């Protein structure tokens, strides 16, 4: 357990898939829709993975 | 990005609860009086953005516009320890301070006066806010600063950014009391016009409900403005921990409020707070349940809005929304939300499905809460249109023996007649008369110029 | 050193043509470049776009 | 070889932003007064023979030549400790010492009048040169002596030396204040002039600009002359401190200047500094980042120009170079470049692509620093014609008055028309145009 949490992380892990993948962090995902909309609303082939990449990290 | 919120502060009353609001922000934020993040204010979890703009790396300020048609009210609260917490460039004072006269329609002129200096006041605001979502006015409307000069604003504000949303919180004149203001009536009724006209939502902060409340629960024979200013901060606080402690939910002001506003019309907001405790009772942070907090806000005494008793309208609730602050467990909150249906705790609308929402919310870490629990109501009730009823009522009373109308016809908004006024009390019918109808099944017709 | 206008004249549209060649295989380049940056997820490669379109003369051809 | 630069100060105002160039330079290279480099300069990483020369081994003499019409300001320069610091092979004085009344056509006619002398000096300072790029002169373009004396000089050096740059530090006249001198406006087309026809880069210096910078950001109610000319000395510094500082990049003046000026019109360049702080300000030295740095040199209370609020025109960055001195991390740099770009912090022109150029340089070892991190900006930028507007704006208020005409027309340039300053003003007003232009699509063909 010592491992775990000084070098994975786990229950620290645990708490970020709350915060992102659970979209705790509200604000934070709402933001990100916002940007996202613009590109959202377009078809995906539309969609640039270096683009959404840069959007995300932009975002965040 | 935090969607920023400018505060404008409005007349006497409007500003001190305005500068009062900003310091409590301030406090929450742990924002020292010159601006500065204390060294305690280590948690980075807050949107300071929505409420304050950074100064420098370190010091944060307000997005906070203190404005008054009389310079007396801006300079209090530039003499008050906060004076350096607020951006310079968003402080608008009137040039002439001699203020509207409790002449709504005399502020209306001031406003329209110094309209170019408001705006490019507002523009300076506008540009410490990285998004800034629209403004918020805190004023009086029985004055002339807070009323007049907040319905030339709002109108101004209407024109130069008419797709952002305006919400005010304007302090209406003690309805049982009599005005020694004659025309208080007439400039309540000329300010609630323009609110109905160019405003988007009015929070209605009734003198004579915070006198009453001054006198019942904190023992205050005479509320002073400042003893209501600071309510108002306490208020302003409670409503910004949502921004203030960043969660899942509710991190914006529209997200909260779409559900609560169905029509432009029905922009009559009520309040409530829970728990409703004395000062000196802080000391107990009391695990006050999901049940007891929902059966304390049911309480009259614990409601923020001094709805009048409508007999002729029946009244009901058509939505509640439940904002609570601390811990808060969520299946405490779903047997509570199931007694409450069980218990018919709680009436919804008519016309279409409506419940009891509830909204968990932390506390700011950088100020100790001396409460376990807190909570706010916001719930759309129809009695709420009984109050504006009311304020028509009186308007009509002064209107009716043109008790101080030459004040208001030494304005030119009011000059030539008090069309204001006539059409304050028709706004306040129409909204009676949906209020009414949002309480019967008949609410999906309500508000069509067929229904009306 | 300097038909001299003429020569000059000829001698920029020459240089105008060298330089759409040289637009257009930078372009090209660039497209490749973004293809690249897919592949390898180099933010390097995006930072240096974003640099070189800042006022969009290279995006329209980007898009192209 | 290294390029040297001669430095050459006319005119009461270019003699004192000269003087204290010099000045700043020294301290920041550990060079003495006498031109000795001192015990404590053993960072022999400075490039001092861009803008000093080497007298012996040991010292380094700047490459500065003292200018003027007027002995006054010349001896006055020569009374400070730096007077050792310049060749004195390489100053050309005036002989009338009579200044040139703060009349342009007057400061031509005593550089006609010292064109021999003028010369000599030039040749004396061009053979202690290995690699002489140009010369640079710094002078007021309000005065006499700054302005025509300068003009003068600047005429001869295009003509006798067509392959060699040409970099000026011109001194601009207040344009927001009205100027006292009611010939300035003279004085600032007769520069004009020369700088679209002689000059091949103008550092407009508008003492406008230094007294809006001096209060609101100096907090200095009063800008001083001398307060103005440790501006200039600070802005200088800034300037050579690639020359102080080698390192990768950078290292030539043309390498620097090739990113401000895309074509042979677009050469008024305009500076930028930062931190901007005032001097009350100094004790907190802020851990500024690159985005924190970039933002406070884009507020307009660290620009230093005073440029007018035009509301008609969407003024915007024609070019950016942002020479950023000191500690700097390039992940910081990444990310203040992508968050500019996002945010749009400055408008480029939309012909052709342009950014912001950023180099990371070392600061002087032998000045300390109270900064971990210092930065300049050069732009071209739309908004500076506005203060070119304003120029050619009193100008043309004076020509159409015929204001101080008659003391021109005393003049032997001005004699007989001022068919000069009218054509400068015309000149003035495309450059104005063309600055507004290049923030347009349009701008491919402004000017055709």
């Not at chain 1, 959202?40 to 969609?47: D, G, I, S």
């Not at chain 2, 807070?146 to 919400?167: A, F, I, T, W």
Request: net charge negative.
């Amino acid at each position: 357990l010592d491992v775990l949490n000084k070098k994975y992380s786990l229950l620290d892990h645990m708490q970020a898939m709350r915060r992102y993948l659970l979209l705790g962090q509200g604000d934070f995902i709402r933001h990100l829709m916002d940007l996202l909309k613009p590109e959202l609303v377009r078809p995906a082939t539309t969609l640039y993975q270096h683009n959404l990449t840069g959007i995300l990290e932009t975002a965040v | 990005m935090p969607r920023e919120i400018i505060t404008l502060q409005l007349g006497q009353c409007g500003n001190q609860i305005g500068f009062e609001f900003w310091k409590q922000l301030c406090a929450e934020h742990g924002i020292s009086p010159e601006g500065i993040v204390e060294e305690f204010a280590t948690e980075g979890t807050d949107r300071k953005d929505v409420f304050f703009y950074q100064a420098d790396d370190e010091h944060y300020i307000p997005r906070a516009v203190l404005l008054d048609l009389e310079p007396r009210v801006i300079h209090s609260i530039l003499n008050s320890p906060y004076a350096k917490l607020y951006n310079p460039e968003n402080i608008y004072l009137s040039e002439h301070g001699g203020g509207a006269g409790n002449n709504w329609a005399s502020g209306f002129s001031q406003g329209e006066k110094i309209h170019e200096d408001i705006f490019d006041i507002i523009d300076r605001e506008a540009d410490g806010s990285d998004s800034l979502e629209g403004f918020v006015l805190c004023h009086s409307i029985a004055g002339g600063t807070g009323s007049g000069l907040g319905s030339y604003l709002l109108e101004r504000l209407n024109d130069r950014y008419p797709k952002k949303l305006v919400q005010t919180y304007s302090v209406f004149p003690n309805q049982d009391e009599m005005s020694d203001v004659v025309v208080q009536p007439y400039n309540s009724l000329l300010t609630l016009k323009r609110l109905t006209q160019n405003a988007d939502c009015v929070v209605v902060l009734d003198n004579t409900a915070l006198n009453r409340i001054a006198t019942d629960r904190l023992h205050i024979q005479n509320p002073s403005f400042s003893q209501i200013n600071q309510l108002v901060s306490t208020i302003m606080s409670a409503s910004t921990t949502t921004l203030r402690y960043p969660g899942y939910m509710n991190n914006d002001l529209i997200g909260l409020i779409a559900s609560l506003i169905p029509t432009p019309r029905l922009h009559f907001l009520m309040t409530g707070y829970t728990p409703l405790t004395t000062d000196q009772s802080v000391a107990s942070v009391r695990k006050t349940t999901v049940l007891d907090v929902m059966r304390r806000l049911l309480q009259p005494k614990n409601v923020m809005v001094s709805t009048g008793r409508d007999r002729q309208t029946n009244h009901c609730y058509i939505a509640i929304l439940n904002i609570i602050q601390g811990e808060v467990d969520p299946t405490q909150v779903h047997k509570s939300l199931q007694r409450i249906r069980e218990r018919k705790l709680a009436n919804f609308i008519p016309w279409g499905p409506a419940s009891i929402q509830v909204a968990l919310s932390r506390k700011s870490p950088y100020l100790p809460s001396a409460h376990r629990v807190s909570g706010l109501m916001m719930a759309n009730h129809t009695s709420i249109s009984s109050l504006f009823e009311r304020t028509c009522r009186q308007y009509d009373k002064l209107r009716k023996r043109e008790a101080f109308l030459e004040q208001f016809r030494k304005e030119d908004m009011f000059k030539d007649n008090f069309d204001e006024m006539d059409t304050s009390r028709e706004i306040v019918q129409q909204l009676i008369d949906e209020y009414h109808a949002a309480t019967r099944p008949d609410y999906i017709s309500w508000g069509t110029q067929e229904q009306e | 050193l300097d038909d001299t206008v003429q020569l000059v004249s000829g001698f920029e549209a020459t240089i105008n043509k060298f330089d759409k060649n040289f637009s257009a295989h930078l372009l090209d380049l660039l497209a490749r470049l973004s293809i690249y940056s897919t592949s390898d997820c180099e933010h390097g490669m995006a930072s240096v776009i974003s640099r070189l379109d800042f006022n969009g003369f290279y995006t329209e051809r980007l898009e192209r």
